[PDB]
Design an enzyme around this catalytic site. Structure first.
Site, short mmCIF file in Angstrom:
data_model
loop_
_atom_site.label_atom_id
_atom_site.label_comp_id
_atom_site.label_asym_id
_atom_site.label_seq_id
_atom_site.Cartn_x
_atom_site.Cartn_y
_atom_site.Cartn_z
CG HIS A 23 -2.03 0.77 1.40
ND1 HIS A 23 -2.49 1.36 2.55
CD2 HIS A 23 -2.93 1.11 0.45
CE1 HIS A 23 -3.60 2.05 2.30
NE2 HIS A 23 -3.89 1.92 1.02
CD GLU B 266 17.22 10.26 8.15
OE1 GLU B 266 18.09 10.49 8.97
OE2 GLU B 266 17.00 11.00 7.19
CG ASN C 294 16.29 14.62 13.37
OD1 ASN C 294 15.56 15.11 12.51
ND2 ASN C 294 16.43 15.16 14.58
CD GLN D 218 18.47 18.64 13.84
OE1 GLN D 218 18.42 17.63 14.54
NE2 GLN D 218 18.57 19.87 14.35
CD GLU E 118 21.57 11.44 7.35
OE1 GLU E 118 22.84 11.47 7.27
OE2 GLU E 118 20.93 12.33 7.93
CG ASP F 207 -0.05 -3.84 2.73
OD1 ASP F 207 0.48 -3.45 1.67
OD2 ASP F 207 -0.43 -3.13 3.70
#
Ligand code: TPX
Ligand code: CA
Length: 240
Positions: free
Chosen positions: A45, A59, A61, A64, A69, A93
């Site tokens: 979905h 990741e 935050n 910021q 990342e 799903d």
């Protein structure tokens, strides 16, 4: 996640943020689980809209730079062929995203451990949901990854009339339902991590909550049961 606590930066390294391009920027829309250096497992979905998606690994935050990342485009989307947008309650799903590049593994970026095929957890098994979804019903997304302890609710209890009734299927895992802690919009697609034989494994893909709200007593968060789809997952990965 409603009723969660901020996760430690390196607790859940397989959690990813699935985002879509919005003007000059990107917006978080769902979670996912890194399962290969170039494959992510999420909810079907989450990729129903014809949007441009990217995955963010390492990741913590969303608002910021964490300096951890890695940003990668989604090159191919394979949704389960029995998925039907009009019927989330039918199940299926689940979707696999092939990343345009293979991500680099480190302490913030690791592959999620999947359960053996067919594995069913005993009622009240210890699990944590993680995600940047709404922190309240009709609230806003979290800035920092959140986690909540959500014990499983087995199929017999979950599919009973006071709980979800016939809406829950045996291809799903229910967890939580205490009225205080739960998944919420934006957590969909992410993992349900459950402790089994000393190792956390991703037993669920967050799928739905009640239309009444996120943290609703006797409406535990519902997840796709990962262990029902192991051969599907392997078949996709091997044929793509
Ligand atoms: C997931 O987040 C789930 C609650 C755990 C949501 C549905 N997923 S969502 O909020 O990502 C979704 C809804 C509808 C569209 C068009 C896009 C995204 C739920 O309400 O059950
Ligand atoms: Ca960040």
């Amino acid at each position: 996640v409603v009723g969660g606590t901020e996760a430690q930066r390196n607790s859940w390294p397989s959690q990813i943020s699935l985002q879509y391009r919005s003007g000059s920027s990107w917006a978080h829309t769902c979670g996912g689980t890194l399962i290969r250096q170039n494959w992510v497992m999420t909810a079907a979905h989450c990729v129903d809209r014809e949007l441009t998606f990217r995955v963010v690994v390492g990741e913590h935050n969303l608002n910021q730079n964490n300096g951890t990342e890695q940003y990668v485009g989604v090159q191919k989307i394979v949704v389960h062929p029995y998925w039907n947008t009009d019927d989330v309650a039918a199940g299926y799903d689940i979707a696999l995203l092939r990343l345009a590049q293979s991500v680099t593994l480190n302490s913030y970026v690791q592959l999620g451990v999947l359960p053996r095929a067919g594995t069913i957890l005993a009622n009240n098994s210890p699990c944590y949901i993680t995600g940047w979804g709404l922190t309240r019903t009709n609230g806003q997304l979290a800035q920092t990854l959140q986690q909540a302890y959500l014990p499983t609710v087995d199929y017999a209890i979950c599919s009973s009339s006071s709980y979800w009734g016939s809406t829950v299927k045996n291809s799903m895992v229910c967890a939580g339902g205490d009225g205080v802690r739960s998944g919420c919009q934006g957590d969909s697609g992410g993992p349900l991590h459950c402790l089994v034989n000393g190792q956390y494994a991703v037993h669920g893909v967050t799928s739905f909550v009640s239309r009444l709200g996120c943290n609703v007593t006797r409406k535990p968060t519902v997840f796709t049961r990962v262990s029902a789809y192991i051969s599907w997952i392997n078949n996709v990965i091997a044929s793509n």
